[PDB]
Design a protein around this ligand. Structure first.
Ligand SMILES: *[C@@H]1O[C@H](CO)[C@@H](O[C@@H]2O[C@H](CO)[C@@H](O)[C@H](O)[C@H]2NC(C)=O)[C@H](O)[C@H]1NC(C)=O
Ligand SMILES: *[C@@H]1O[C@H](CO)[C@@H](O[C@@H]2O[C@H](CO)[C@@H](O)[C@H](O)[C@H]2NC(C)=O)[C@H](O)[C@H]1NC(C)=O
Lengths: 106, 225, 215, 97, 225, 215
């Protein structure tokens, strides 16, 4: 009944979000909500380099226009985060690319 | 022993209908041998019209008496059937058979021919797109169809192809029904759900092979996702 | 005029079992001159037994006939998938002869829930002044099923022809299509169109409907 | 019987309303309760819990709806996890503050 | 017309077994009337032991001849049956019936009594917990059982209760089997899987009402979740 | 010595249909002095027909007897749920008399997949020197079923008694229990214990097993 552009949101850990034996590790969450079509491609970029390992994407589930939600988790290292590395979530939607840039800089 | 029928495929109501039963390999000289006509409307049982014995002996049905005539010609070895006062409800396929004696009745049958009695003309078929409005229930699979309407006589074969001219096995063929002097039929196709929500192809072509035109309209896919 | 009535019209049998076909005549037939015929859709009918007791050339011995007078029964041993066709009993002692209604035998299968889909008429078709709403039933058993049209809570009648396909060769199921025909002016005066499907394997009836303008 | 790990995610420093996700992983058995706190006060509405999924280990995720003004007001948000009679509390705040 | 049996419920092998058939309301004076004994081992058919007519006329089975004795006492109006050389395979329930003439045989039947022939003693039943080891397949529901063993005679009723002394409708009662001179039986109960992963109750109590002790052991649930 | 054999041992009938019970005698019976008895589990047997042709007091007229000599058939019209009990035929012209094996009639129902559960012996029971492994089958039809014990790929034999319950009053299904008995020393010499269940409604056999020490 309708087509809406996907929304890109990136979640990052806080300053006290790292735990475990050294080196500490955390996770990054990229979620798209109220997007159509249901299929979606999620890719992670680190300083222009594609990430091909250490990531797990949950299956798309249903949250009147039909809505869907997708959750993706990427494992990151504390050392890389401290080096002001920029993480970008790549979303593909009918040939359109949406990018969101996040960083620890204030 | 074999029999072959022949005649016009389209006749107007309230006219004269003539059919010929072509047989070869025997002669109507021995006793007991005879030829009869049996018709069967679609969805109904066999109907007996008339039977003719040797020595120019003919029998007629009282329900259809004074309406049919039986004539035979030994020179051409074929019986001639004449039908008057044609009615749309009398449309059926006519068969002829040979009786090899007094007890063995209708041992050999031919092939028959469809004789349609409709006031209309043999116009080209008309295709109409069909979009499924199903919602809130995708289920296991979904189906789409193609509405072939306004065709005469009923002889249509359905084939489904994708945008890239692929092959689809539907095998779902609904029989035609006489509605308002014309035959109407619908054909559907079963496709996997995953394939529909995948390739960029947003439409498929509906193809019909009728001897009145080679038109082929395309039905746009509603797309699931 | 000898009236021949065959019952039951439709019976469900399994391969390898025995099938008995009944033929009822309105009066006695002289010399028991009753014959049986086999007809397959598409092809031409073929004679099997003449005189109710003598088989013809090219007919297997598994077909047996018995009875006389006004009661005749056709017994077939070793039922085959190719034998699931319509059979007719006919007598040739009348002159003119008459044919019976015929009985159809189907392969027994388990009950499968049908799928219901409704296609609203296309915009192009509405321009011609005729609107056709279809109601499709697929993969149901037995063939007996009730299809009722309900629009604006008003039950329709006298305007449904109903077309049903034959038994599937590989699935043994049945399918039928019901088409709703109405005037273009009447179509614009109604909002919701729905066809009700009732099946033996469904606890409650399932109804599907659509809203005008959203499709 | 292993204590579940409690992790709280925060919105990006350079901007996004937003949502708070509390994840408990590698816990047993399956049943688990997750709630949210706001400045030491119980939250009665605005939070939902997703069905528990299988990663034997299980995973549970909870979503809390928050506003931009409330997050920037240095309000303290705590994710409460109860498992095998043990309560775990994790406190987060603005990193740039 | 009614009949009542009586005798010892437990007899050792290779001993003397005596049973009395108590009847009241008629006298063995008219011709045709007679009394007979019929036994039936569990899982087997009826077995004919002996029959006695009037005028002190008695009949015996050749397969069991010179092993049974029939005596009647008109003063007490009850027939006395004596069984010697008791064998464990001969354990069965003995019934007596009255024949009201020559054609109407065994018109009225009594109630019977179970006569168990076991070398062991009537010891208290022993319960054993059963832990479900099912894994990787929760299925519809989970089941837990209770193995009542070493009981004699076979008279046990099973009831299932929760930790809070609730009521359960199991109705799963298995018949007892003679194994090594003792009867063994098993009882189970079906409980929903949701309740296991919910209330803190981790065990249920198995209760048996046998006239040799009022013990009741508890079967702990394995918990799957 | 008159040997009486009744066949079939178990037959599946439906309510309202007709049931025919056969009684075979090893020799002719004088004066056709054959009687039928009805027995219900738990209660006492009750006489129905004496002399194979005369009913007794308090017996419905729906029970009919026929035949003579060495062939006797018991026909019952209007089968009732309470009539699904064991019936015995007995003759009183022998002196001493003999009883037949008896036939059991069950309610016909559809095939339902059984549930298989195995409980390893408890630690407390092992202290007594006896280990009992159980194999429970519930909600299966027909009553005929094969239960085989396989431990360490060695098929066991001569050590299974097998207990089977009666037909359920409200479910019409059957249940049986199989108990595995072995010495305590032999129990410690085997690792995996499994019972194989074969059912008509299962495409492939289902096997359940457990590992020692994990339960
Ligand atoms: C035409 O396009 C369709 C796309 O809908 C192709 O179908 C896909 O390709 C595979 C291999 O032929 C099919 O089996 C599947 O139905 C489709 N794949 C997936 C992942 O859904 C089809 O193959 C194309 N035709 C040709 C000749 O290549
Ligand atoms: C004893 O505890 C059990 C818990 O295992 C109670 O069972 C629950 O309570 C309802 C109402 O009685 C039952 O119908 C259900 O089986 C259980 N609830 C759910 C949600 O499954 C049981 O009620 C308790 N006994 C008493 C007397 O209260």
């Amino acid at each position: 009944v309708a087509e809406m552009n996907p929304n890109v949101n990136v979640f990052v850990p806080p300053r006290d979000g790292f735990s475990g034996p050294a080196p500490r590790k955390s996770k990054l969450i990229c979620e798209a909500t109220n997007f159509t079509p249901k299929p979606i491609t999620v890719s992670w970029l680190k300083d222009g380099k594609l990430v091909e390992s250490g990531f797990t994407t949950d299956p798309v589930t249903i949250e009147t226009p039909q809505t869907y939600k997708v959750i993706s988790t990427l494992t990151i290292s504390e050392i890389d985060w401290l080096n002001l590395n920029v993480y970008t979530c790549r979303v593909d939607h009918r040939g359109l690319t949406f990018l969101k840039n996040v960083s620890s800089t204030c | 022993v074999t029999l072959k029928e022949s005649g016009p495929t389209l006749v107007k109501p309230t006219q004269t209908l003539t059919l010929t039963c072509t047989f070869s390999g025997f002669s109507l000289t021995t006793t007991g041998e005879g030829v009869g006509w049996i018709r069967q409307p679609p969805g109904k049982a066999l109907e007996f019209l008339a039977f003719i014995y040797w020595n120019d002996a003919k029998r007629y049905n009282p329900s259809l008496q004074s309406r049919l005539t039986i004539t035979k010609d030994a020179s051409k070895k074929q019986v001639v059937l004449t039908l008057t006062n044609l009615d749309p409800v009398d449309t059926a396929t006519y068969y002829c058979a040979r009786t090899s004696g007094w007890d063995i009745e209708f041992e050999y049958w031919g092939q028959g021919t469809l004789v349609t009695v409709s006031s209309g003309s043999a116009s080209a078929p008309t295709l109409f797109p069909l979009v499924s409005c199903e919602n809130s229930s995708p289920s296991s699979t979904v189906a789409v169809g193609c509405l072939a309407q306004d065709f005469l006589p009923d002889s249509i074969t359905f084939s489904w192809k994708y945008k890239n001219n692929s092959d689809i096995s539907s095998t779902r063929g609904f029989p035609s029904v006489l509605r308002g002097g014309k035959y109407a039929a619908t054909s559907q196709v079963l496709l996997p759900s995953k394939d529909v929500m995948q390739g960029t192809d947003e439409h498929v072509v509906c193809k019909v092979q009728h001897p009145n035109g080679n038109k082929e309209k395309d039905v746009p896919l509603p797309v699931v996702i | 005029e000898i009236v021949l009535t065959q019952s039951p019209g439709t019976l469900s049998l399994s391969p390898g079992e025995r099938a008995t076909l009944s033929c009822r005549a309105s009066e006695t037939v002289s010399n028991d001159k009753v014959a049986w015929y086999q007809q397959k859709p598409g092809q031409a009918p073929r004679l099997l037994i003449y005189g109710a007791s003598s088989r013809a050339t090219g007919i297997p011995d598994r077909f047996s006939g018995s009875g006389s007078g006004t009661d005749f029964t056709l017994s077939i041993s070793g039922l085959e998938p190719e034998d699931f066709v319509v059979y007719y009993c006919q007598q040739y002692a009348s002159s003119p002869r008459t044919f019976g209604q015929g009985t159809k035998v189907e392969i027994k299968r388990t009950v499968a829930a049908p799928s219901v889909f409704i296609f609203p008429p296309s915009d192009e078709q509405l321009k011609s002044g005729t609107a056709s709403v279809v109601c499709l039933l697929n993969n149901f058993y037995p063939r007996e099923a009730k299809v009722q049209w309900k629009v604006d809570n008003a039950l329709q009648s006298g305007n449904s022809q109903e077309s049903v396909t034959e038994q599937d060769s590989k699935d043994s199921t049945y399918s039928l299509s019901s088409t709703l025909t109405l005037s273009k002016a009447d179509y614009e005066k109604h909002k919701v169109y729905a066809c009700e499907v009732t099946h033996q394997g469904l606890s409650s009836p399932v109804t599907k409907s659509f809203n005008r303008g959203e499709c």
